[PDB]
Design a protein around this ligand. Sequence first.
Ligand SMILES: Nc1nc(N2CCC3(CCC3)[C@H](CO)C2)c2cc[nH]c2n1
Length: 167
Amino acid sequence: VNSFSGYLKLTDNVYIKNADIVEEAKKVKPTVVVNAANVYLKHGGGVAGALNKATNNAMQVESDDYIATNGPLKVGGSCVLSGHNLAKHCLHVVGPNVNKGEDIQLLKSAYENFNQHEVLLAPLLSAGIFGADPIHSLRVCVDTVRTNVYLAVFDKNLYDKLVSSFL
Ligand SMILES: Nc1nc(N2CCC3(CCC3)[C@H](CO)C2)c2cc[nH]c2n1
């Protein structure tokens, strides 16, 4: 039993909800919140920009130190950093950005990072400003993640379309 509330159960391990991931994180304080990161951990917009704003830019400060030490992530890769006031940890995961020409096959690799964590609150990778089809992203998530994933979907219209079209 965990503290996630009001989710629709999609499969054995995947749950979905129409919710702002920022407000969901602040209420649940999950062990792991997933950020829709880029390789430079520059959290300017989308889910990343919103999560960082909620940390009063502490996420960005921590991220800049991480990059200065380690260099950029790989597309499809991840790193674990602090969750600040939102979660114990933030798993920064880089899904491919279609608006940069990045290979969509890397979306499966991106979701594989979730399997290193027993329970996660996450957005749909490569959705929103990353330019991929959120329906496809959900399919890859379901077919790749084996740990317990709670998806927060910001747009109510998109949430209903995801549910109604789910196979
Ligand atoms: N669950 C959730 N998702 C977010 N994003 C941003 C927009 C897209 C649609 C294009 C990509 C995704 C929809 O879920 C993911 C945000 C941003 C702020 N808060 C959020 N909360």
